Design a protein around this ligand. Structure first.
Ligand code: CND
Ligand code: CND
Ligand code: ZN
Ligand code: ZN
Ligand code: ZN
Ligand code: ZN
Lengths: 374, 374
C-alpha cells in the first residue's frame, strides 16, 4: 500500500528453469526519476511466460515474469508526467519512448527501448528493483506482472479509463492486442477474404476476432486439440480442421479447401514447422503470411526461397503492430463502448497464489486465458 | 520468311547442360488457334537463360531458350484478335490469361497459366512447335526467343508502339520491367528512403533505376565486382560497397552506415546466403526486403525467424509484379516519352550468331546486357 520507501510483498519468483514458481516475499524499491510503482490487480497467463520457464525464451534468472496485466498507480517518480497516483494503468512490454527511429516511423512499433531483442532483465537504469532472500531478482520485459507491486518506466506504462474493469481489460496488455492487431494492423485482412489461423489459444482466438472485424469470408481454425474448436467457432471461425485427422499434409488440405491457397495465414503457436506450413498454405502469388508465435531461442528454420519468388509476403509482428502507449488506451475505450468482447477468452480466474495451477491448466489444454487476481 | 506453313530457319538449341548453344536449323510450325508466329529482331541475354545452361534452373532439354525480346508478327492463328501481322510485339514469359484467380486479382501477376512453377517446355496444348535434326525441341517459358522465328500463345504476347525501337524496347521483355517493377511496384520504395541493392547487373541496375524514380534519398550498391561500380553510380547509386574489402560481415557494415539498417533491400544475384544477408541488413521493425534473384533448383536456405518477429517484411516477385499484357504496352510508351533510359544497360550488341560470345561476356563479368540482333 502507501509509500515513499521499500515495500515488502509477495511475488512469484522463478529461480530455475522447468521449476514451479515460488511465491515469496520481495522488497520492491521506490520509483526513481521517470518510473512508476503499480499495485497489481489482475494478470493473464500467456504462453510467453511459459516459454521463460521451459527455457524456450532465454532471459536472465532469477526473475519475476508476467507481461499481461492491469493495476493501479500507487506512487509516481520524480519527473513522471503521464500518470498520477490512483490512476488505473496497463504495463507495456513493448515500450514507446517517442524519440527513437521506430517510434518516429508511422508504421513501426518495435521501439528501440525494448528489452526483448537482448534481455538484460532490467530497469532502463540497468538496475533491478527487486530483492528476494538478499539476492536481486531480474525484471521481465521491464514489466514483471506476477507481483503485487511492480515498478515500470514511464516509457513503458499507459493510462486507462477509470471505469475499466481491470480484470477484463488486462487482456489488452497482450493476448487480445497482439492477436487482434496481427489481423487488422499487420496483415490488413480484407473483406470477403479467406484466412487460416494456426493455433487456437488466447492469442489465436484474438486473431480470429480480428479477421471477423476485417470482414473475412472464411476463417479456418487449425489445431491438434479438437476441444478448442467450440470457442474458435463461437468467436468467428467458419470451420476448424485437425491436422491429425488427415493422411496428407495440412498445406495440401488447406490449399485444396481454399481452391489454391488462403489469402491470409497466421502462425500463432511458435514452432519452426508450422511457420513454414502456414507460409506454403497461402496463395502463391499474393498471399500474406504473418508469424505471430514465439519460436525457441536459437533455432533456424529451413525453407525454399521459391515460395517467396512467386509473390508471397511473409511478415512477423510484436504486440500486434500497435504503437503501445497510443494504442492501449484507445483499445480500452473501444472495449468500453462494446465493440468487441473479451469474456470468450477467459476460461479461469484464480487467486494469484494458485499461479502454478493456472500454468498447469495452460499446459494441459483445458484453458484459453486464466486470469490471476490479487 | 512469310508463310501459312512450316518455316525452316536458324536457332540456338541447348541439347545438354554445361555446353555451348548449337546454332542450327529448326522447323518452326504454323500457329494453331490463338497462337502467333513472330519474326525476332532483337534479344537480351539475361542471367536466367544462363541458369538454364548451368542446370540451376531446371527445364526440359533440348530447349530453345530466351525470355527478353521484341519482334514483329509474321502470321497469326485462328481466333487471334489482339495482334496482326506487321505489328511490333514483345513475348511475355509471364502470361496474362485474364481469366484465372491471380489475373482477376488486383495485385497478383503470376498467372496460373505460367510454365515456370512446373516447366513442361511446351505450349498451352502440351505440344512443341520446334523440330531440330528430326526430333522435337522444347519451348522455354513459352517464349523461346533465341530463334529467328518462334510461336507464342495469344496470352503471352503484347502489342507495342509501331514506332518503338525494337533493339532497345526488348529490355522491357524482362531486365528493365522486372528490376524497375521490384522497386516501384513490389517493395514500393518511398521518397527519402535508404535502399540497398545486392547485385549490379542489368536487373540490379534497373532496380536502382526504380529506387531513384521512387525518390530514394540513398541507394547503396553491393557487388564483389568492383568494375560494376561506375555504371551503378551512373544510373543512380549513391554509394557502392564491395564486401571483400571489409573484415566484418556485410550486414554489420550495411546496418552501421544506415544507422541501424536500411529501409528496403533487394537481392538481385540469386544466392541463398545473400537473400539472408539482404534480409538482415534492413531495419528490424519496418524494413522490407525483396527477393529478385533466382536460387538453385531445390535448395533450401536456413534462417532465424526472430528476424521476422521483429517487424520485417520479406517478399519475392516475378516480372517486377507487373501484370504482363497491360503493363508492357504502357511501359514502352513511357520509353517513347523519354520517361527512362535503357541505354546505360547496353554494353554490347552482337549478331544473333554470336550468342555464345554474349554468354561468355556475361560470365566473364564485363557486360550488363548484350543485345543479340537478327
Ligand atoms: N508476437 C507477440 O507479441 C507474442 C505475445 N505473446 C505471446 C506470443 C506467442 O504466441 C504463441 C501462442 O500464445 P498463447 O495463445 O498464449 O498460447 P496457447 O499455448 O494457449 O495456444 C497454443 C495453441 O497451439 C496449438 N498447437 C500446438 N502445437 C500445435 C501444432 N503442432 N499444430 C497445430 N496446433 C498446435 C495448441 O493446441 C494450443 O491451442 C506462443 O508462442 C506465445 O509465446 C507472441
Ligand atoms: N525475378 C524475375 O522475374 C527474374 C527474371 N530474370 C532474371 C532474374 C534473376 O535476376 C538475377 C540477376 O540477373 P542479371 O542482372 O541478369 O545477372 P548478372 O550476372 O548480370 O548480375 C549478377 C551480379 O551479381 C554480382 N554478384 C555475384 N556474387 C555476388 C555476391 N556474392 N555478392 C554481391 N554481388 C554479387 C555479380 O558480380 C554480378 O555483378 C539472376 O539471379 C537472374 O536469374 C530474375
Ligand atoms: Zn504474450
Ligand atoms: Zn522508441
Ligand atoms: Zn530475366
Ligand atoms: Zn491468368
Amino acid at each position: 500500500s502507501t509509500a515513499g520507501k521499500v515495500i515488502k510483498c509477495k511475488a512469484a519468483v522463478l529461480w530455475e528453469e522447468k521449476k514451479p514458481f515460488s511465491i515469496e516475499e520481495v522488497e520492491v524499491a521506490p520509483p526513481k526519476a521517470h518510473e512508476v510503482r503499480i499495485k497489481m490487480v489482475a494478470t493473464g497467463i500467456c504462453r510467453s511466460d511459459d516459454h521463460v520457464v521451459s527455457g524456450t525464451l532465454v532471459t536472465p534468472l532469477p526473475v519475476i515474469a508476467g507481461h499481461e496485466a492491469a493495476g493501479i498507480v500507487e506512487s509516481i517518480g520524480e519527473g513522471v508526467t503521464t500518470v498520477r497516483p490512483g490512476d488505473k494503468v496497463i504495463p507495456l512490454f513493448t515500450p514507446q519512448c517517442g524519440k527513437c527511429r521506430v517510434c518516429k516511423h508511422p508504421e513501426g512499433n518495435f521501439c528501440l527501448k525494448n528489452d526483448l531483442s537482448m534481455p538484460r532483465g532490467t530497469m532502463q537504469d540497468g538496475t533491478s528493483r527487486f530483492t528476494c532472500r538478499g539476492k536481486p531478482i531480474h525484471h521481465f520485459l521491464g514489466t514483471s506482472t506476477f507481483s503485487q507491486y511492480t515498478v515500470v518506466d514511464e516509457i513503458s506504462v499507459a493510462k486507462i479509463d477509470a471505469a475499466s474493469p481491470l480484470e477484463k481489460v488486462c487482456l489488452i496488455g497482450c493476448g487480445f492486442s497482439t492477436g487482434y492487431g496481427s489481423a487488422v494492423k499487420v496483415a490488413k485482412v480484407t473483406q470477403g477474404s479467406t484466412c487460416a489461423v494456426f493455433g487456437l489459444g488466447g492469442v489465436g482466438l484474438s486473431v480470429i476476432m480480428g479477421c471477423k472485424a476485417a470482414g473475412a469470408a472464411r476463417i479456418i481454425g487449425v489445431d491438434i486439440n479438437k476441444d478448442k474448436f467450440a470457442k474458435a467457432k463461437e468467436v468467428g471461425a467458419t470451420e476448424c480442421v485437425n491436422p491429425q485427422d488427415y493422411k496428407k499434409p495440412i498445406q495440401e488440405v488447406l490449399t485444396e479447401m481454399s481452391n489454391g491457397g488462403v489469402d491470409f495465414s497466421f502462425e500463432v503457436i511458435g514452432r519452426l514447422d508450422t511457420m513454414v506450413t502456414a507460409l506454403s498454405c497461402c496463395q502463391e502469388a499474393y498471399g500474406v503470411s504473418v508469424i505471430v508465435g514465439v519460436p525457441p531461442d536459437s533455432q533456424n528454420l529451413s525453407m525454399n526461397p521459391m515460395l517467396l519468388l512467386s509473390g508471397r509476403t511473409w511478415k512477423g509482428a510484436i504486440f500486434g503492430g500497435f504503437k503501445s502507449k497510443d494504442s492501449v488506451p484507445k483499445l480500452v475505450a473501444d472495449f468500453m463502448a462494446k465493440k468487441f468482447a473479451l469474456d470468450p477468452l477467459i476460461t479461469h480466474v484464480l487467486p494469484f497464489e494458485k499461479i502454478n495451477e493456472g500454468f498447469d491448466l495452460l499446459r494441459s489444454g483445458e484453458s484459453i486465458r486464466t486470469i490471476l487476481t490479487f
